[PDB]
């Protein structure tokens, strides 16, 4: 696992889908939202570049990559909404919102 790495052996795993409040999962989620939105931005820039230069088999892959980047982002947005709902109902949670 790329994010928790070796610590996954000891069962720290802050990527897993979470619906109770957890400041550790909320921290991971806020970090990964920013990275994946930048990654979606880069993916659609790369599509625009390769469409402009017109190379057909590359346009196909750039669109396929962009769709995957959007899907991976959408998972983190779903995680963000779960945690933000749990934040509002849980005492001592963050005051700044997730997502």
């Amino acid at each position: 696992p790329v994010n928790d790495g070796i610590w996954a052996w000891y069962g720290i795993d802050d990527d897993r889908p979470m619906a109770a409040w957890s400041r550790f999962h909320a921290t991971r989620c806020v970090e990964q939202l920013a990275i994946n939105r930048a990654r979606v931005g880069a993916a659609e820039w790369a599509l625009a570049d390769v469409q402009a230069r017109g190379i057909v088999p590359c346009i196909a892959k750039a669109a396929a990559h962009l769709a995957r980047a959007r899907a991976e982002l959408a998972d983190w947005e779903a995680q963000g909404h779960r945690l933000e709902a749990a934040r509002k109902v849980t005492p001592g949670a963050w005051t700044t919102p997730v997502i």
Partner: protein, 39 residues
Amino acid sequence: GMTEEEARRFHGYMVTGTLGYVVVASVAHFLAWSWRPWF
């Protein structure tokens, strides 16, 4: 995604399995003690 309900449910099994495991090991030790005491 995981709720606190699921955590409380899992914790009950974890405590129960731990206790059952400790029960069996306690009987095993008393059998071994009855057979050949180590003190």
